[PDB]
Amino acid sequence: NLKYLSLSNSFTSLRTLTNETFVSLAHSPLHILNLTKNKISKIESDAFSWLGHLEVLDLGLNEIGQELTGQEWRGLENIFEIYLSYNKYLQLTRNSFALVPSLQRLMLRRVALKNVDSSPSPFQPLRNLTILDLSNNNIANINDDMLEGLEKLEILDLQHNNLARLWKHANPGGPIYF
RNA sequence: CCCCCCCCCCCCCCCCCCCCCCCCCCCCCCCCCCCCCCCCCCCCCCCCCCCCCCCCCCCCCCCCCCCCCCCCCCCCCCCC
Ligand SMILES: *[C@@H]1O[C@H](CO)[C@@H](O[C@@H]2O[C@H](CO)[C@@H](O)[C@H](O)[C@H]2NC(C)=O)[C@H](O)[C@H]1NC(C)=O
Ligand SMILES: *[C@@H]1O[C@H](CO)[C@@H](O)[C@H](O)[C@H]1NC(C)=O
Ligand SMILES: *[C@@H]1O[C@H](CO)[C@@H](O)[C@H](O)[C@H]1NC(C)=O
């Protein structure tokens, strides 16, 4: 009957989240999982495949430095919020969030975001996305179709980045209308 | 039919340097909040001790009065 589980700063050595870490939570109807401040460094594929009813996943304030292949979110069929702010570095790809179309909140502040300007936008499948946070990442380049199709977006945080060149009339190809 | 040598222009890539722009970290100063300790001022409280004042109680002392008992002395009258 477990619906809420907080594991914030509960461990000394939890560096890698393999596909066997949460197998003991398979039969729990877990909705909220908090994993902040655990010095987590790597998330493997199918790490959260055992949490099918999960709605909130908080992974901020860790040392996660990797490239999000998108397989880390397999099995998250009811997820609504993913918190990833204040990690080492996150590199996005075409299918980083292709397995979680039900996502509504995505926080990516202070993660030193890389490759957010992919030709197919990493945020394209997120049709229900409402809140997106990309602040304090020193992002310099954004394509005009980064947020295409996100008709439900309501909050967009882009402060403390470097987007000045994109809005200059002398920028090659003209200003970026994102 | 075939090589080599010059000229301009257009490039590509790797380094160096200089620019704005931004991020992170740190330093200096200031401000705010919280915590701890300490000082100063004023109004008080309780307890103890000392002193003073009022009132009261008990005991005692001094003086006086009353009653009882005891003793001495004065008048007067009878009995044998
Ligand atoms: C996960 O747990 C952490 C730590 O308990 C929560 O972080 C706190 O969040 C509140 C509200 O945002 C802040 O006021 C506190 O300062 C935070 N504490 C720390 C140490 O950062 C976090 O909110 C939890 N996440 C979820 C989704 O519940
Ligand atoms: C976890 O991944 C390993 C490596 O791919 C695999 O051998 C193993 O069967 C997986 N565990 C489960 C429970 O699927
Ligand atoms: C997005 O939200 C709408 C409205 O609640 C819903 O119909 C749709 O199923 C959602 N999409 C996903 C993938 O959950």
Walk me through this protein's architecture.
- With 178 residues, the chain is mostly beta strands.
- Helices cover 0% and strands 17% of the residues.
- It is built from no helices and 11 strands.
- The protein has strands spanning 4-6, 16-17, 32-34, 42-43, 56-58, 65-67, 81-83, 89-91, 105-107, 131-133, 155-157.
- Strands 1-3-5-7-9-10-11 form a 7-stranded parallel β-sheet, with no helix packed on it.
- The protein starts with a strand and ends in a 21-residue tail after the last strand.
- It binds one RNA strand of 80 nucleotides through residues 110, 112, 136-140, 160-165.
- Belongs to the Toll-like receptor family.
- This is Toll-like receptor 3.
- Glycans are attached at residues 19, 34, 128.
- LRR repeats lie at residues 1-21, 29-50, 53-75, 86-107, 128-149, 152-173.
- It is found in: Endoplasmic reticulum membrane; Endosome membrane; Early endosome.
